[PDB]
Amino acid sequence: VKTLNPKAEVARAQAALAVNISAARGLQDVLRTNLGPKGTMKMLVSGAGDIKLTKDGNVLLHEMQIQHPTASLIAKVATAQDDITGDGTTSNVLIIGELLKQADLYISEGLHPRIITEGFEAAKEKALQFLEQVKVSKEMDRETLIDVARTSLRTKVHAELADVLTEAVVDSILAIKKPIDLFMVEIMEMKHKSETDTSLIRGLVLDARHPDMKKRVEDAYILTCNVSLEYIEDRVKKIIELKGFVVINQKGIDPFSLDALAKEGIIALRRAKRRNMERLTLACGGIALNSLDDLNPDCLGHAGLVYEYTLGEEKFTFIEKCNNPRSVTLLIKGPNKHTLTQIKDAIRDGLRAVKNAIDDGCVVPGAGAVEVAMAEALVKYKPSVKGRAQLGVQAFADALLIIPKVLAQNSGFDLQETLVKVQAEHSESGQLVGVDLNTGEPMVAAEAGIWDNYCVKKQLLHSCTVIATNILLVDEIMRAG
Amino acid sequence: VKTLNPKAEVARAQAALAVNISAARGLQDVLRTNLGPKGTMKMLVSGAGDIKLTKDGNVLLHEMQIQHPTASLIAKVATAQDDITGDGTTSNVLIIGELLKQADLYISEGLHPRIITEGFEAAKEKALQFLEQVKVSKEMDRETLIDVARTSLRTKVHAELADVLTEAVVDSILAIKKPIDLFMVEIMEMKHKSETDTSLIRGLVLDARHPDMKKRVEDAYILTCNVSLEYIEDRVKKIIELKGFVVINQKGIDPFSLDALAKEGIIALRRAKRRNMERLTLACGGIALNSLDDLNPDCLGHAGLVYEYTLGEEKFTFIEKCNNPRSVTLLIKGPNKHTLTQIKDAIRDGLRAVKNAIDDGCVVPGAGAVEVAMAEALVKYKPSVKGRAQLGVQAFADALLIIPKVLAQNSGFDLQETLVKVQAEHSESGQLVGVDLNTGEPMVAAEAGIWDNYCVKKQLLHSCTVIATNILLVDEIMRAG
Amino acid sequence: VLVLSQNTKRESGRKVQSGNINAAKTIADIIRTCLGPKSMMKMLLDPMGGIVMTNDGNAILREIQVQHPAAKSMIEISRTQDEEVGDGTTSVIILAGEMLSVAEHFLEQQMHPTVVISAYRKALDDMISTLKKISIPVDSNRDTMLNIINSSITTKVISRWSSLACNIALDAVKTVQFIDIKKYARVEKIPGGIIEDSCVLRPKACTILLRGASKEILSEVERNLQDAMQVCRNVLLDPQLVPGGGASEMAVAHALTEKSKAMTGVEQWPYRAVAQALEVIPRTLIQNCGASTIRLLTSLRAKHTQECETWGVNGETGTLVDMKELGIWEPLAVKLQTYKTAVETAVLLLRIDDIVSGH
Amino acid sequence: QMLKEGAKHFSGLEEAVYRNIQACKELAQTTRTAYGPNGMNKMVINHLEKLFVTNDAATILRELEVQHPAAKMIVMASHMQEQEVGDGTNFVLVFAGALLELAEELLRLGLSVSEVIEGYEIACKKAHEILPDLVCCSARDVDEVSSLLHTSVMSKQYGNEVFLAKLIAQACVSIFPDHFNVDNIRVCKILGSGVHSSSVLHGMVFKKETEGDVTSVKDAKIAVYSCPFDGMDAQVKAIADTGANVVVTGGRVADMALHYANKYNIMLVRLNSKWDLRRLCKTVGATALPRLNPPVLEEMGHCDSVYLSEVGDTQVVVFKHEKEGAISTIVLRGSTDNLMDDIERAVDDGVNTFKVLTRDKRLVPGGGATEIELAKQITSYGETCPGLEQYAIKKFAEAFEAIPRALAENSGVKANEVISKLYAVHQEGNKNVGLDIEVPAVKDMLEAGVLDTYLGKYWAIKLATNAAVTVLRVDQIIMAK
């Protein structure tokens, strides 16, 4: 009686539950050593000479070809933490992992799975609500932005020059805010020189065609166009009539058109990336029509200084000094191209946090300060709900204490020892007490300047508890071979 | 390295602790099946096919061929719990076991054994001191004594006739207390009839050899004789002249000597256990002379009523109404012999229960009522000690909650669920809150009569902590020489 | 000898009841957990690394590659039930499995099938009369219809904006109601925005214009709405509704059992077997709550036989409560077909005493 | 290490239940065939290559090699039941198993073992209350006597002479039943002719050894001796002076002591078992005279008839016709040892049954009738007793349905059909309604004659119950190898 296909491993009772939780807890163990400002990056070597060295949890869980039908879900959770927010990706992973382990404790004791489910759900209500009662209301000031932007850059490779990058971010976000929009920061990486050369250019930066055309224009009227300029003169005559000194073409130019434009002293470039064409229309405020006879003075960009400097034996056309650069470009110079990839990803997250910071003057005491708090709040919240839930809530509180523990773990200090000191002081000073590894003792986060955005934290518990519990209900899957 | 001899097992590192913990835990669970009023006695069969069926934990752990070096130790714990106190022998085994469980949880987390020991130890002292604050003060009150002795008989076989036996226990203990002495209560078990005929005699009960010897001597003067009355009439002449109407001989009596003794109206018995002779000299005030010619009218014990009535087709010699009303006999009438075996153990504990009740006016609410209390107390005592020590106390408190859990276990009810109710009701009613399985809900143990002696609880924590912790130190035994 | 083509398996007599019954019983216990709001959605991973997370018994049976014909007929039971109304797909499956589980037992006592089946088919007729003898007749009427349609949208991805979907289903069904036709309600789903930007488009046949931010979400809003319309299609054919939470099953059970002693004979047992089988609904129900199934069952039939039929299993309180008072009602049609589709299947399934395959 | 030593088979919880229950079922069903006139005997042959053909369950179990713990408990139930009244030996067995079977099914469902016992124990007391009310009291009275004796003779190999074995046992137990005792009945298995030749001798039969002696002594002056007659003249001469014409020596007799006893016309009998001597002292009034010098005329018992009959071709002295013969002898006759064995086995039973009457007149219509009634009553009782116990109580009764089930079983009648019919007709025909195997159909047992002893049933329920309960508690037992 073969009711199932051959080689169809099936898990029913505790088996599935246990096997599932373990797989998630394990992965949480592989991503736990990169949390906090002292965490350590990871080098993902995809059997093929490929070496991906990053610290971000998501990226890592996206490169590792996991087979764990459970870990995949975990990889999905971290994905919902990098999109809806950015950093903290790691944190969320450790929460769901450790949490499930806390439940397993209850289950193996006799507690019904679904029953424990409501616990974390009911405790989640309190956990989130508490975040609301601990959120320190900040402003869009530069300092608070430089302090939070830096902390974001830290825990990474550029931690060596986080101070500088942080500056470039606070300026890029302050210049794009009028309702912020990160999609206004053109991240352009370029090798050569050290990472201490990264600058914030307030305009596009390409990578004059004919040697007879001017090479350095003072105030060039960007007359961007798409259609090719080849079959030619009638096309060149219309450009000079529209007062277009610097024509940025998307396609190549005809050899007999480059001499005509070079004659009028017109600076025209050919074969420009489509992304750059859009970044130049939003930065210099110019319109890039199609044909040539259509262009007009109404589609001219107001650049302030368009020169061509070969910073690295590679001629680069810098179209800076824009009237209102709604499209800021954050130039990034790094020693190795690989270093750029990381720095770039770091900024992308660093900028994100800032956006949140200016989109709401709110922030929570990081370094585990919040966790230690919620945990303490839930402990006093369990005797009220009572019932088998009391345990669920308490367990949820203990699970939240994983953040501080791990921190001391990645620092080199005693896990339990630190937890005690931090908890004692916390139950004294307040929501301002956190775990400062840089000192090896419980300090005031709000004082040291260590703060975390609201959205981040909030999203963490949500994506966690929610998905986390679901896995717990899945007592079977049924497969084949 | 060859410091050991061939064939020498060695426990090393965590391995030892692991095997030890699981060990003590396993045997702890096996004996946990006979705890409570719904417990289940076990039938141990040694090599000779013997069949030991009892409920007491100690005896069980004394018949089971334990190969676990740790369990063996757990056997020494249950022993020191039965020799010093007695009842509850099981309770101890569970505590120490569950205790190690809480510890290991911590050890595997990274916590060092030493710090954990200090944690439990810190809770022990406080615990023992709490039992001194929660002890119910009563007195030699006959009422409370009946309750305790009754509760003791319960959870066993005689639980069917607790009311009767209990009463007899109180009386026997009230007439043997000077400073109570159990060696003054002779427990005589006899088959035939039901166990509802058990009576309490105030003398001696031996289990006239010749058909011509009086079957009832009034002021029967016992002429204790140890030597044999065989190779005769001259020995019988020396007794009649010493005025010995009741010659209780320790050795056999020559058939011809019985005819000369019965011809004089002398009531002589033969083959009397040495232990019965010494009990006849300490009750009637007689002197046991070796030779038959060393006896005299001044070595005859004074008896009031020595009658030989049938206790089930078997004529027993009752020598009650002794000149010293401090020597009582607890006759046990019951069905089979095996039944009286268990019952006899019940009285042994009933007498000891009442004994300590009068010698110590302490009577704490058993049925876990105390456990839960101490637990909650420590939970609020751990925040005042903090450090990794906080954990120790907590764990010790969580280990104390095993008793109430096991109660809801052997009963069938939900272990965890019930625990919440009892705990929630204990912190609302007081120290009188216990786990009443007969009602399937937490009730006032001090209202149902369920009471336990202070000595028990007190001695408990003592024997537990000491040994338990010591089992965390011995990380290697190595069998060499 | 090869009476029939080599390698052609042929179970006979008892060898058939075994492999057939169990296989069906087992497959019924698989999606069993996926019953109630405490459902345990399994993560079906096809033999290719797939990841199918679902609660619906049908969707699950359509993912698990089955080889034994008996378990295949089940996947067909959920195909018919899931097409009619939708929900309760697991109900009809769990019942069909139990009936075989309680039947096999009787087979142990050597109760020839002929007798059994006879009692099963007849018992089936009893439940139908019972269902109607205790159903709560509720009104058309926009108000009522809303409640009915709402309860059919409170468990899916559309529950988010059930209220809106209800008014949409109510209108689409109340308008194409001449017996209402489920083919006159055109559903025009358009990706983009939130399900809140929906509006019924009016007519002997309207044109409901749904909206869905995604492609999977939009099709879901179409199905749930169609189901929300179905219940409305029932209030037009079966304006009867019986209390859920198991209240129904318990009643029919207590009734059937009583009838057993009145019928006596050999079929006196099967009658009870079917009644006791209906107890699985409230049993497994409370189970999804982590509460004592047995204990509950006791107190259930307790206050149930004493104070009307208005009592049912309260999963949120893990105790028995007056369903009627709480406002828990389920269309009689929902229950009506369930018992039917179930018993029927089990019946003819028990008539299968051999299956000519190939290996 | 190993939790328990080597060679120690253990079982915990359900694991044990299954084994105990199973072993008991097979053992209870094995003898189940030995029930009713369809009782299928068995042939057990021990080490000594001895063939035992018996229908009595007790005789079977006490000859089968049982080493299973729980299984041995069944041997005890049959042992006690056989010692109580004899009849129903198999009743207890089967029933005991059914109980465990219904109970085990309750546990696998999730029900607590505790409740199981309670429910069963409570129903055991209810039944012991229903039986005494439903029972059919009968009238002593030779008319009623033969009725019960006639219903206790069937179901065996001597059913061909159920009329003879009825009168034979009716006469014996009606000559000295003061307070009747089954020990005053001596049955003899003499080979020769069919059982239709069995006779009833008012006295005690044995085998003499001397020929020339008086083979048929009138008013004999019996003198029971135990001391050997070896050296012989003064010993035999001192017996002729007292007037002892009948010598019943316990040990051997010297050839010269025989020739002298042969010359004094004194019928001497040597090699007389110790029990035959005691039975001869309480039938004629003889005194157990040890030595051969103290005998006198007041130590001689009177036996009006002491002849030498060679019935079946084997000499046998018949000491019949005495003053107060308190012990009669049943002279059995058989064509084969096989038939002689079975007959006697059943004779004893009837002796016990009659002994039940002298201490209990009550009787119930057996054949399953009473069982069904109790089942009916108990079931209803369960519905009157709320709580989870309602299930246990009803299950207990469902067990009684195993008795009639076995009845129609050893007959080839579909239980499912006969049972359902029985109950229906039983709920209308009341108690009397039962099952007549000789004619597969319901029938009034009271009319059919089939009437069992009330006391016979009583003990059965209690013994079986208490026993089964015990085996269920001990759910964990290793050993001590």
From Swiss-Prot, chains A, B:
GO terms for cellular component: chaperonin-containing T-complex; microtubule. One of its GO terms (molecular function) is unfolded protein binding. It catalyses: ATP + H2O = ADP + phosphate + H(+). Mg(2+) binds at D87. Keywords: Acetylation, ATP-binding, Chaperone, Cytoplasm, Hydrolase, Isopeptide bond, Magnesium, Metal-binding, Nucleotide-binding, Phosphoprotein, Ubl conjugation. GO terms for biological process: chaperone mediated protein folding independent of cofactor; positive regulation of establishment of protein localization to telomere; positive regulation of telomere maintenance via telomerase; protein folding; protein stabilization. It is an enzyme of class 3 (hydrolase). It is found in: Cytoplasm. Its EC number is 3.6.1.-. ADP binds at G36, G88, T89, T90, S91, T155, K156, A367, D452. It comes from the Eukaryota. The modification Phosphoserine is found at S199. Component of the chaperonin-containing T-complex (TRiC), a molecular chaperone complex that assists the folding of actin, tubulin and other proteins upon ATP hydrolysis. The TRiC complex mediates the folding of WRAP53/TCAB1, thereby regulating telomere maintenance. NCBIfam families: chap_CCT_zeta (TIGR02347), thermosome_beta (NF041083). Component of the chaperonin-containing T-complex (TRiC), a hexadecamer composed of two identical back-to-back stacked rings enclosing a protein folding chamber. Each ring is made up of eight different subunits: TCP1/CCT1, CCT2, CCT3, CCT4, CCT5, CCT6A/CCT6, CCT7, CCT8. Interacts with PACRG. This is T-complex protein 1 subunit zeta.
UniProtKB/Swiss-Prot annotation, chain C:
Mg(2+) binds at D87. It is an enzyme of class 3 (hydrolase). It catalyses: ATP + H2O = ADP + phosphate + H(+). Its EC number is 3.6.1.-. One of its GO terms (molecular function) is ATP hydrolysis activity. ADP binds at G36, G88, T89, T90, S91, T155, K156, G245, G315, E316, E330, K335. There is a cross-link at K9, K215 (Glycyl lysine isopeptide (Lys-Gly) (interchain with G-Cter in SUMO2)). Keywords: Acetylation, ATP-binding, Chaperone, Cytoplasm, Disulfide bond, Hydrolase, Isopeptide bond, Magnesium, Metal-binding, Nucleotide-binding, Phosphoprotein, Ubl conjugation. ATP binds at G36, G88, T89, T90, G245, G315, E330. Residues 1-18 are annotated as: Disordered. The modification Phosphoserine is found at S5, S163. It is found in: Cytoplasm. One of its GO terms (biological process) is binding of sperm to zona pellucida. One of its GO terms (cellular component) is microtubule. InterPro entries: Chap_CCT_gamma (IPR012719), Chaperone_TCP-1 (IPR017998), Chaperonin_TCP-1_CS (IPR002194), Cpn60/GroEL/TCP-1 (IPR002423), GroEL-like_apical_dom_sf (IPR027409), GROEL-like_equatorial_sf (IPR027413), TCP-1-like_intermed_sf (IPR027410), TCP-1_chaperonin (IPR053374). The modification Phosphothreonine is found at T264, T293. Component of the chaperonin-containing T-complex (TRiC), a hexadecamer composed of two identical back-to-back stacked rings enclosing a protein folding chamber. Each ring is made up of eight different subunits: TCP1/CCT1, CCT2, CCT3, CCT4, CCT5, CCT6A/CCT6, CCT7, CCT8. Interacts with PACRG. Interacts with DNAAF4. Interacts with DLEC1. Component of the chaperonin-containing T-complex (TRiC), a molecular chaperone complex that assists the folding of actin, tubulin and other proteins upon ATP hydrolysis. The TRiC complex mediates the folding of WRAP53/TCAB1, thereby regulating telomere maintenance. As part of the TRiC complex may play a role in the assembly of BBSome, a complex involved in ciliogenesis regulating transports vesicles to the cilia. Belongs to the TCP-1 chaperonin family. This is T-complex protein 1 subunit gamma. The lineage of its organism: Eukaryota, Metazoa, Chordata, Craniata, Vertebrata.
UniProtKB/Swiss-Prot annotation, chain D:
Mg(2+) binds at D87. It is an enzyme of class 3 (hydrolase). The modification Phosphotyrosine is found at Y18, Y458. It is found in: Cytoplasm; Cytoplasm, Cytoskeleton, Microtubule organizing center, Centrosome; Cytoplasm, Cytoskeleton, Cilium basal body. InterPro entries: Chap_CCT_theta, Chaperone_TCP-1, Chaperonin_TCP-1_CS, Cpn60/GroEL/TCP-1, GroEL-like_apical_dom_sf, GROEL-like_equatorial_sf, TCP-1-like_intermed_sf. There is a cross-link at K414 (Glycyl lysine isopeptide (Lys-Gly) (interchain with G-Cter in SUMO1)). The modification N6-acetyllysine is found at K274, K355, K421. ADP binds at Y35, G36, G88, T89, N90, F91, M154, S155, K156, G367, D452. Belongs to the TCP-1 chaperonin family. Component of the chaperonin-containing T-complex (TRiC), a hexadecamer composed of two identical back-to-back stacked rings enclosing a protein folding chamber. Each ring is made up of eight different subunits: TCP1/CCT1, CCT2, CCT3, CCT4, CCT5, CCT6A/CCT6, CCT7, CCT8. Interacts with PACRG. Interacts with DNAAF4. Interacts with synaptic plasticity regulator PANTS. Pfam families: Cpn60_TCP1 (PF00118). The modification Phosphoserine is found at S11, S147, S273. This is T-complex protein 1 subunit theta. GO terms for biological process: protein folding. Coiled coil: none annotated.
